[PDB]
Amino acid sequence: FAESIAIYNEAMDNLIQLLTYPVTVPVEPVVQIGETTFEEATELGVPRGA
Amino acid sequence: ALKTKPRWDKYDGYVGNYRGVLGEDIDLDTEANRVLAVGTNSNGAIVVGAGQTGIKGLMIVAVGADIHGAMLDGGINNHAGDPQDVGKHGEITNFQPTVFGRTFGVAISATEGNVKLAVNGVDTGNIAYDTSAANLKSGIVAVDDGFTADDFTVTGTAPNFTIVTTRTDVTITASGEGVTVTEATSVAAAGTNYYGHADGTVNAVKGSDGVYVGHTQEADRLIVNVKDEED
């Protein structure tokens, strides 16, 4: 049977080593940050905060 | 030198004196270097006079002039979409009331016959001592000077009328006997309450639309304290 399984084995290895990686950090963050804008200056008044 | 012109003397900028953007171009001959009563339109934008909100502040569009005394056109604080400063709380020095165009009181001394007015020194057709308000308009329009009906307004009753105008370059006077003409005049008066209007003018008279913008102290100054217009 080790001759008949050999091609199935080789195919599973090539897919495993190309599709997979060993985990070393069990949890991963993803974040949503927001943004800022400039405004045009006036002579006397002041801009909005950020 | 020759003239003083209105300026903010105290304006803080953190106490609800606010930046906005203009909704329209400011007229440099008619609205620059004046105290403009302002609101905001249905967008976020400053307008002269009552917008959607009513009067919410005062604005001074400060503009320089060339050595010949004309306004600098290419400014960045006076076109639609330029940013501008509006004050609710502060002081304006070299204060003057704001009025647009020219306005003339006409009154007739004659009780019989006809009288004559001059427009920029050229004489009008004869008008009765009892002409209609419709026939002061028609008389004043009817000379080969190129102004036409489009920039005169007339209102009154036979003894007297007001000839209003949007332009500054037209002057009415008397020229015949039996009629008198006075151009109206505005100058600041000490110890007076000033009032912004839906036109954007600032005057000592509250009519049916006047919204308190401040009080003067000595005539050359205005203490601004806008009683914001409400629904």
Side-chain angles (χ1 to χ4, degrees):
Chain A
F1 104 109
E3 296 298 336
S4 61
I5 68 95
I7 60 100
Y8 297 87
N9 175 53
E10 176 60 22
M12 292 189 288
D13 278 353
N14 290 323
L15 288 175
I16 283 165
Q17 80 168 318
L18 194 62
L19 295 178
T20 71
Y21 66 94
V23 174
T24 61
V25 184
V27 176
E28 293 285 354
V30 292
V31 290
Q32 310 198 117
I33 298 185
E35 72 173 8
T36 72
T37 183
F38 273 69
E39 61 170 272
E40 203 173 345
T42 68
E43 191 170 19
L44 303 178
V46 300
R48 307 181 315 256
Chain B
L2 180 65
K3 304 205 306 287
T4 57
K5 48 190 176 287
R7 290 293 178 260
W8 288 104
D9 179 35
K10 298 99 176 166
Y11 176 104
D12 170 80
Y14 292 89
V15 300
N17 297 350
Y18 65 93
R19 293 189 169 179
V21 307
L22 295 174
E24 62 194 347
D25 300 336
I26 304 292
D27 185 295
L28 296 185
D29 301 338
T30 319
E31 298 174 333
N33 295 309
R34 290 165 177 80
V35 182
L36 301 169
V38 298
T40 179
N41 66 0
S42 62
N43 310 135
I46 306 159
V47 292
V48 180
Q52 177 164 269
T53 57
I55 301 301
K56 316 307 294 195
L58 297 179
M59 182 169 74
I60 297 175
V61 183
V63 186
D66 63 24
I67 72 177
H68 306 108
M71 299 291 184
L72 304 184
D73 179 51
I76 60 151
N77 64 300
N78 54 276
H79 311 286
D82 293 338
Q84 257 296 118
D85 265 301
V86 181
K88 295 180 186 289
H89 308 291
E91 289 171 33
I92 292 165
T93 53
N94 305 106
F95 169 73
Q96 298 177 250
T98 295
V99 61
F100 305 126
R102 313 276 292 286
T103 179
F104 304 90
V106 176
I108 47 81
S109 312
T111 53
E112 175 61 301
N114 289 282
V115 306
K116 298 177 71 71
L117 299 178
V119 185
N120 291 6
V122 302
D123 283 291
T124 309
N126 291 14
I127 45 174
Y129 87 93
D130 208 284
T131 189
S132 181
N135 283 6
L136 258 292
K137 160 68 84 74
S138 301
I140 287 171
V141 168
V143 302
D144 202 17
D145 78 343
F147 298 136
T148 82
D150 296 349
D151 54 29
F152 292 111
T153 291
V154 179
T155 290
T157 50
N160 54 60
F161 323 84
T162 59
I163 314 298
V164 191
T165 59
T166 39
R167 293 170 68 139
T168 52
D169 61 357
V170 190
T171 306
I172 311 296
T173 78
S175 60
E177 297 301 340
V179 65
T180 183
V181 179
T182 45
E183 194 183 334
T185 192
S186 62
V187 61
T192 301
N193 301 351
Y194 269 85
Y195 290 91
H197 289 268
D199 299 349
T201 61
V202 174
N203 316 94
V205 179
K206 183 206 276 185
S208 314
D209 74 321
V211 46
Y212 175 90
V213 298
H215 80 281
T216 172
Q217 301 304 128
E218 76 286 0
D220 312 287
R221 180 164 57 132
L222 179 81
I223 320 305
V224 184
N225 211 258
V226 185
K227 296 265 288 293
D228 273 355
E229 190 164 15
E230 77 177 69
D231 303 284

